[PDB]
Design an enzyme around this catalytic site. Structure first.
Site, PDB file in Angstrom:
ATOM      1  N   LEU A  17       0.760  -1.270  -0.095  1.00 21.31           N
ATOM      2  CA  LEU A  17       0.029  -0.100  -0.097  1.00 21.31           C
ATOM      3  C   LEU A  17       0.760   1.233  -0.118  1.00 21.31           C
ATOM      4  CD1 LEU A  17      -2.957  -1.194   2.471  1.00 21.31           C
ATOM      5  CD2 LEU A  17      -2.911  -0.651   0.115  1.00 21.31           C
ATOM      6  N   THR A  21       5.352   9.421   1.160  1.00 25.15           N
ATOM      7  CA  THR A  21       5.607   9.920   2.391  1.00 25.15           C
ATOM      8  C   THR A  21       5.498   8.770   3.407  1.00 25.15           C
ATOM      9  OG1 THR A  21       4.894  11.106   4.445  1.00 25.15           O
ATOM     10  CG2 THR A  21       3.380  11.023   2.657  1.00 25.15           C
ATOM     11  N   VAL A  25       4.511  -0.398   3.311  1.00 27.86           N
ATOM     12  CA  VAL A  25       3.258  -0.759   4.219  1.00 27.86           C
ATOM     13  C   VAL A  25       2.598  -1.777   3.446  1.00 27.86           C
ATOM     14  CG1 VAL A  25       0.968   0.187   5.362  1.00 27.86           C
ATOM     15  CG2 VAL A  25       2.986   1.783   5.011  1.00 27.86           C
ATOM     16  N   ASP A 127       1.145  16.660  13.645  1.00 29.65           N
ATOM     17  CA  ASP A 127       1.114  16.512  12.169  1.00 29.65           C
ATOM     18  C   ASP A 127      -0.443  16.358  11.745  1.00 29.65           C
ATOM     19  OD1 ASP A 127       2.369  16.682   9.941  1.00 29.65           O
ATOM     20  OD2 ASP A 127       3.126  14.708   9.942  1.00 29.65           O
TER      21      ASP A 127
HETATM   22  F1  LIG Z   1      -2.579   5.978   4.951  1.00 32.42           F
HETATM   23  C1  LIG Z   1      -1.915   5.478   3.816  1.00 32.42           C
HETATM   24  C2  LIG Z   1      -2.045   6.208   2.773  1.00 32.42           C
HETATM   25  C3  LIG Z   1      -1.157   5.759   1.653  1.00 32.42           C
HETATM   26  N1  LIG Z   1      -1.464   6.434   0.598  1.00 32.42           N
HETATM   27  C4  LIG Z   1      -0.475   6.426  -0.636  1.00 32.42           C
HETATM   28  N2  LIG Z   1      -0.924   7.520  -1.418  1.00 32.42           N
HETATM   29  C5  LIG Z   1       0.173   7.687  -2.630  1.00 32.42           C
HETATM   30  C6  LIG Z   1       0.951   6.350  -2.842  1.00 32.42           C
HETATM   31  C7  LIG Z   1       2.118   6.843  -4.000  1.00 32.42           C
HETATM   32  C8  LIG Z   1       1.898   6.282  -5.456  1.00 32.42           C
HETATM   33  O1  LIG Z   1       1.338   5.134  -5.419  1.00 32.42           O
HETATM   34  C9  LIG Z   1       0.263   4.754  -4.737  1.00 32.42           C
HETATM   35  C10 LIG Z   1       0.343   5.176  -3.235  1.00 32.42           C
HETATM   36  C11 LIG Z   1       1.456   6.292  -1.465  1.00 32.42           C
HETATM   37  O2  LIG Z   1       0.609   5.939  -0.538  1.00 32.42           O
HETATM   38  C12 LIG Z   1      -0.342   4.728   1.857  1.00 32.42           C
HETATM   39  C13 LIG Z   1      -0.258   3.833   2.962  1.00 32.42           C
HETATM   40  F2  LIG Z   1       0.569   2.992   3.202  1.00 32.42           F
HETATM   41  C14 LIG Z   1      -1.033   4.496   4.135  1.00 32.42           C
HETATM   42  O3  LIG Z   1      -1.273   3.830   5.406  1.00 32.42           O
HETATM   43  C15 LIG Z   1      -2.127   2.967   5.754  1.00 32.42           C
HETATM   44  C16 LIG Z   1      -3.097   2.512   4.767  1.00 32.42           C
HETATM   45  C17 LIG Z   1      -4.177   1.603   5.312  1.00 32.42           C
HETATM   46  N3  LIG Z   1      -4.482   1.532   6.657  1.00 32.42           N
HETATM   47  C18 LIG Z   1      -3.384   2.123   7.629  1.00 32.42           C
HETATM   48  N4  LIG Z   1      -3.312   2.255   8.868  1.00 32.42           N
HETATM   49  C19 LIG Z   1      -2.441   2.539   9.313  1.00 32.42           C
HETATM   50  C20 LIG Z   1      -1.801   3.215   8.411  1.00 32.42           C
HETATM   51  C21 LIG Z   1      -0.479   4.102   8.513  1.00 32.42           C
HETATM   52  C22 LIG Z   1       0.782   3.318   8.392  1.00 32.42           C
HETATM   53  F3  LIG Z   1       0.681   2.639   7.134  1.00 32.42           F
HETATM   54  F4  LIG Z   1       1.950   4.049   8.492  1.00 32.42           F
HETATM   55  F5  LIG Z   1       0.839   2.312   9.295  1.00 32.42           F
HETATM   56  C23 LIG Z   1      -0.403   5.624   8.226  1.00 32.42           C
HETATM   57  C24 LIG Z   1      -0.536   5.216   9.501  1.00 32.42           C
HETATM   58  C25 LIG Z   1      -2.384   2.831   7.173  1.00 32.42           C
END
Ligand SMILES: Fc1cc(NC2=NCC3(CCOCC3)CO2)cc(F)c1Oc1ccnc2[nH]cc(C3(C(F)(F)F)CC3)c12
Length: 268
Positions: A17, A21, A25, A127
């Site tokens: 995922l 930033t 994940v 943040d």
């Molecule tokens: F919220 C998240 C958003 C994104 N989005 C993203 N947009 C562009 C991109 C670049 C272009 O390519 C496509 C994605 C990079 O990513 C990606 C993530 F991994 C996210 O993390 C989670 C996802 C779902 N459940 C979660 N529960 C907790 C967490 C977080 C942890 F992951 F840090 F743990 C945050 C606290 C979490």
């Protein structure tokens, strides 16, 4: 309990995922979770996180992404958290365009409920922004918990290097900016050099930002922005106080507003 078991023994990995930033994940199943993985390197010492680890496990609230435990198994730290299938509000608004005032009002209420809880545990989020407000497929709102040498520093320089001196009311300001971000797709001054912004915000003549189009928004929204963005931290209302504000205490605010946003997302 910073387990050493191997995540792959409690969880199946589903899809990656991360990127940008957020770093590395994974979606995973036991119940769906997110696993954030950090590469432990030479001088790394897990025991220095000890402090900021207990801060996570005992911070339990519906509007706070749940922290289920950590793993070190093999040169890598894995933090297992509540899964939010729709990512951040920024992931969403980059596809749907600006949120409606009612959607923003629901988001603000849910964030303020989370902030009231963190502030009650003497935690400052630090943040608040679209990128750190996560949405699940139920349209529910969760605050995400992210995050030279000191050998020559005076102890008073060291204290600031950690804390700041400022207090939890900085989160109230960040929520105001987030509300404008949700309305207009960028924070105020987004096209201005970051250094210049720091200097401008620092002047005693600084005017708190405003919503650009007055006519598009209710007086309650304009007032929510005006009070969240109080310059002086001493006169800036608390999370608890902000939750009695008209914008966030109006009836009709519920996850339906976000399910709508998520329909618009997959059917754009
Ligand atoms: F919220 C998240 C958003 C994104 N989005 C993203 N947009 C562009 C991109 C670049 C272009 O390519 C496509 C994605 C990079 O990513 C990606 C993530 F991994 C996210 O993390 C989670 C996802 C779902 N459940 C979660 N529960 C907790 C967490 C977080 C942890 F992951 F840090 F743990 C945050 C606290 C979490």
């Amino acid at each position: 309990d910073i387990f050493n078991r191997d995540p792959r023994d409690h969880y199946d990995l589903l899809q990656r995922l991360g990127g940008g930033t957020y770093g590395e994940v994974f979606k995973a199943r036991d119940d769906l979770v997110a696993l954030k993985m950090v590469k432990m390197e030479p001088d790394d010492d897990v025991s220095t996180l000890q402090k900021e680890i207990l801060i996570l496990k005992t911070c339990r609230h519906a509007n706070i992404v749940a922290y289920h435990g950590s793993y070190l198994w093999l040169q890598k730290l894995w933090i297992c958290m509540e899964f939010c299938g729709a990512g951040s509000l920024q992931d969403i608004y980059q596809v749907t365009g600006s949120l409606s005032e009612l959607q923003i009002s629901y988001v603000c209420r849910e964030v303020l409920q989370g902030l009231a809880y963190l502030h009650s545990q003497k935690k400052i989020h630090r943040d608040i922004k679209g990128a750190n407000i996560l949405i699940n497929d139920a349209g529910e709102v969760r605050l995400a918990d992210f995050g030279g040498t000191p050998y020559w520093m005076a102890p008073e320089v060291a204290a600031v290097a950690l804390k700041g001196g400022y207090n939890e009311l900085c989160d109230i300001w960040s929520l105001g900016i987030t509300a404008i971000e949700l309305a207009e797709l960028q924070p105020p001054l987004f096209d201005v050099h970051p250094l210049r912004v720091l200097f401008l915000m620092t002047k005693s003549g600084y005017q708190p930002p405003r919503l650009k189009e007055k006519g598009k928004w209710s007086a309650a929204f304009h007032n929510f922005i005006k009070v969240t963005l109080t310059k002086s931290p001493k006169k800036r209302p608390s999370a608890t106080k902000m939750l009695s504000h008209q914008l966030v205490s109006q009836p009709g605010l519920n996850r339906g507003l976000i399910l709508d946003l998520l329909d618009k997302l997959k059917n754009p």
